[PDB]
Amino acid sequence: IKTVLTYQLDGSNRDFNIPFEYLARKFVVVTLIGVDRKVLTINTDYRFATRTTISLTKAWGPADGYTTIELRRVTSTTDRLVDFTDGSILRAYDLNVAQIQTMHVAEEARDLTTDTIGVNNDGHLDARGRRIVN
Amino acid sequence: KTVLTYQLDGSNRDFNIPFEYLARKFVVVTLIGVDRKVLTINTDYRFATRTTISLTKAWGPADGYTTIELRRVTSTTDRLVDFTDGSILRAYDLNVAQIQTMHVAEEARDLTTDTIGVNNDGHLDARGRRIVNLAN
Amino acid sequence: RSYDMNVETAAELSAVNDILASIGEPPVSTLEGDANADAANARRILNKINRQIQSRGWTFNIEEGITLLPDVYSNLIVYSDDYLSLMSTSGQSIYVNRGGYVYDRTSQSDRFDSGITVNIIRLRDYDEMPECFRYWIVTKASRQFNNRFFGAPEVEGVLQEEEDEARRLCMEYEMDYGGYNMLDGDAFTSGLLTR
Amino acid sequence: SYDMNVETAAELSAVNDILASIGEPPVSTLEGDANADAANARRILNKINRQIQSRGWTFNIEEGITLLPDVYSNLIVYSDDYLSLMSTSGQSIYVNRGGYVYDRTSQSDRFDSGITVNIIRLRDYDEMPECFRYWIVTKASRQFNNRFFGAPEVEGVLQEEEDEARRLCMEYEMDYGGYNMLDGDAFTSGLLTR
Amino acid sequence: LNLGTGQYRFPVVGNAKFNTVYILSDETTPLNIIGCGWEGNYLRRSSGI
């Protein structure tokens, strides 16, 4: 509660705060939705000022054509943080990190609802803009 | 089957739960109603056996609260197992450590079927609803 | 045990294991946490050398014609620490960084309206690198972590040879990959061969 | 990076030979019993298996193979099994950005209908010519003899063996490829037309 | 009776720390053990003291 949050973009605000308990850091992705999805790189444009804030360097805004900074956490299924290896002490920090990472993946799996088509008032399925394709 | 609605007419206390749960705090019970209401546990619903909840009073269709919809909300922050330095590991410990994540995933994959979702035929079934705001 | 298992591993984590195998110690399970020093040091020497192997320009790294764009309000283009090199497309590069912003040295202007086009070496991660180099980033880190911490001379003297073999293979990788031509593909003597 | 979670009898005789390199007795199974040395040996074998395939060799380099983009995504996965993607003619244009093939030149990660690339892909140790299977071991027999049992005199003999193994390996494709100067290439095959 | 005097050299291979040797006899005949040797490569990298 909640992995995927979006902010609002005005030209002069550059600091946005991250609620979720991100493991790693490569795990937070910050994409400026605006009119067209655009992903921000780890240091050229946005930079983690505190553990809990992502401070843009350029201070984007609508004047650039981008609104609604979307910073969501995507845990990596392949790049596991713990790889047990024979002959290594089974430290409890390892088991706990493994469990935390897999539970983070499931927690973000719980957010696909914020992702999908969406139900309006009534049962009406909704597509806000977003022309259905295929 | 994290969700199943138990529409019952009278003050029927017994409502069996088929979703195996890890703890009492995960099963949340609401009455489907004109307004959905989250019934609190000690005061309103009590677990007669782990399998069956038993409500006090049970409201009703006559009451505004209508049907009862119990569901599983398995918490993703409060980990049931905390491995610490021995502290003998316990088989029950590792298996539950993985069951909590399997449960979160499985009950999260039903938060999609409530929407369009997919029939056995392979087709995305709108449940006879109207798609609004679309563009050509 | 099933033969039918394809399972993956952290290419970043497996690189730190190879560093700690080299100096001579057991594999460390997880890199996470700033407690283990060996992981932090082995991970940093990995990162501190990743920015060198990439900085030397190679054909894949050097993006060409990348247009950096100015902030609309302040008209200044930021020079990051991920921009390993920013150089003009043609010759006599005019861009330098003043206060963290691209500055045109020739016109003495930090203010750019409408953008600049340049060859940027972008810094990318161990996992976006060609295997040829992913070996060499580790086995160069396997020398400096052997140098700075485990100063036994006999295994650095063994490992040096390996870093050199790796350089040879890494070089061979782009002379194939770039595919560079003397007389048919360059700027000058491609023009002389026109009949 | 593909990791080692499966076993093979023909591969087991290689880890025995890497444990011979120190002077250690042969393991019988690679079960996971706490044999640090055997674990490290499996690591060095795999870690060097991904060099010998990386240096391109004729049977290793699949030529002209087509990678297909996933239809809805429109991008191609560039996995860690693909040691060198390259391109078929010159100035290879494909690079890994994220995990997907990106055309360095056209700034697009989106492809429709695929690419003809020359890919060197990882093959198992077992799926390797016997000439190389020796040399992957006896190269791993050096670095495993340098990282854990650092005796210089048993290494200096081994380095003279790694080189012989390399010679024998190189001899293997110069036969196997069958490369022709004046009758088989792209330029001076065309000049000899009468 | 087969009773003999000599040195029996047998191969013990591996790190000293993890190798164990035991002599076990349940036979009717006698036994004598005078001394025991061992050889082996030694390589300490960190030249101590």
Curated annotation (Swiss-Prot), chain B:
Superkingdom to which the source organism belongs: Viruses
Subcellular location field: Virion
Function: Structural component of the short non-contractile tail. The tail comprises six fibers made of gp17 trimers, 2 nm in diameter and 32 nm in length. May attach to host lipopolysaccharides (LPS) to mediate primary attachment to the host cell.
Similarity remark: Belongs to the Teseptimavirus fiber family.
Subunit relationships: Homotrimer. Interacts with tail components gp11 and gp12.
The protein's name in its UniProt record: Tail fiber protein
Species assigned in the record: Escherichia phage T7
Residues of the full protein shown: 6 to 141 of 553
From Swiss-Prot, chain C:
Annotated disulfide bonds: none
UniProtKB keywords: Viral genome ejection through host cell envelope, Viral penetration into host cytoplasm, Viral short tail ejection system, Viral tail protein, Viral tail tube protein, Virion, Virus entry into host cell
Record bears the keyword Coiled coil: no
Coiled coil: none
Functional summary from the UniProt entry: Structural component of the short non-contractile tail. The tail complex is involved in viral genome delivery. Forms the 12-fold symmetric toroidal domain immediately below the connector protein gp8. Once the tail tubular structure is formed, the interface between gp11 and gp12 generates the proper environment to interact with the six fibers, each made of gp17 trimers.
Subunit organization: Interacts with head-to-tail connector protein gp8, the tail component gp12, and the fiber protein gp17.
Annotated protein name in UniProt: Tail tubular protein gp11
From Swiss-Prot, chain E:
Highest classification ranks of the organism: Viruses, Duplodnaviria, Heunggongvirae, Uroviricota, Caudoviricetes
Coiled-coil stretches noted in the UniProt entry, renumbered to this chain: none
Protein origin, superkingdom: Viruses
Function: Structural component of the short non-contractile tail. The tail complex is involved in viral genome delivery. Forms the end of the tail, including the canonical tube, the nozzle, and the small extensions below the fibers. Once the tail tubular structure is formed, the interface between gp11 and gp12 generates the proper environment to interact with the six gp17 trimers.
Subcellular compartments: Virion
Entire-sequence positions represented here: 746 to 794 of 794
Name assigned to this protein: Tail tubular protein gp12
Assembly with partners or alone: Interacts with head-to-tail connector protein gp8, the tail component gp11, and the fiber protein gp17.
